[PDB]
């Protein structure tokens, strides 16, 4: 089947940066678009950005683009997110999902396990 | 920009019981193209992902069961579910899959 493989949970202490990867299987990333979410104990969910592998072209929200960056890498077929200065805000789970681009539509289906990342 | 807004946040449910949940946005989701409104549903469990129930807002996931219904159309939607089973409670997310940004409502909790 496709799967999505995340990386093992994080901690961090408050203004250090942080590198998450979200690795596919089943499908070459190329094809698909790779997209972050973050989710607080809250329960709501956050989209965070996008990014097209294979143009380089990334989306992300305004809340998020001045601390998240989407770095992917095709020989690997693995995606990232890096951030930037944490803070208690940014405690959360961070889910990876992907979309196929090539295909009239196609909702964000699989999804990745989620790594958790805590900064205090 | 678009805000989903679900309702109610809490519901207090039995077995065999048949449930109705609200997901209002706030522009219309609907594309004038195709006539397809882009709204999706999720359910979650605790310490699970994220998991596609359905899209176009009444089109089932390859492989969700019947008892789950979605419709509604431009702003307002709704979910269903007759006679809801044990396995059937999580969260459930509504989410504008029309325009950046994504966003999500903040969901739905079936308790016991």
């Known amino acids: 089947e496709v799967q999505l493989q995340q990386s093992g949970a994080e901690l961090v202490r408050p203004g250090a940066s942080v590198k998450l990867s979200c690795t596919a299987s089943?499908?070459?990333?190329?094809?698909?678009?790779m997209h972050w979410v973050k989710q607080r104990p809250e329960q709501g969910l956050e989209w965070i950005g996008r990014?097209?592998?294979?143009?380089?072209?990334?989306k992300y929200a305004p809340k998020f683009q001045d601390k998240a960056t989407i770095i992917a890498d095709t020989s690997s077929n693995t995606a990232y997110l890096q951030l930037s200065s944490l803070t208690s805000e940014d405690t959360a789970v961070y889910y990876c999902?992907?979309?196929?681009?090539?295909?009239?539509?196609?909702?964000?289906?699989?999804w990745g396990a989620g790594t958790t990342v805590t900064v205090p | 920009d678009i805000v989903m807004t679900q309702s109610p946040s809490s519901l207090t449910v039995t077995a065999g019981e048949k449930v109705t949940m609200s997901c209002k946005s706030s522009?219309?989701?609907?594309?004038?193209?195709?006539?397809?409104?882009?709204l999706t549903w999720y359910q979650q469990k605790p310490g699970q992902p994220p998991k596609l129930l359905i899209y176009?807002?009444?089109t089932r996931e390859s492989g969700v069961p019947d008892r789950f219904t979605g419709s509604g159309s431009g702003t307002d939607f709704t979910l269903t579910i007759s006679s809801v089973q044990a396995e059937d409670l999580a969260v459930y997310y509504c989410?504008?899959?029309?325009?950046?940004?994504?966003?999500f409502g903040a969901g739905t909790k079936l308790e016991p």
């Open positions: 999902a992907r979309r196929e681009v090539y295909s009239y539509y196609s909702p964000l289906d699989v």
């Open positions: 089943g499908f070459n990333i190329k094809d698909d678009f």
């Open positions: 990014i097209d592998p294979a143009n380089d072209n990334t």
């Open positions: 522009q219309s989701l609907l594309n004038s193209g195709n006539q397809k409104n882009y």
């Open positions: 176009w807002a009444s």
């Open positions: 989410q504008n899959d029309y325009s950046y940004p994504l966003t």
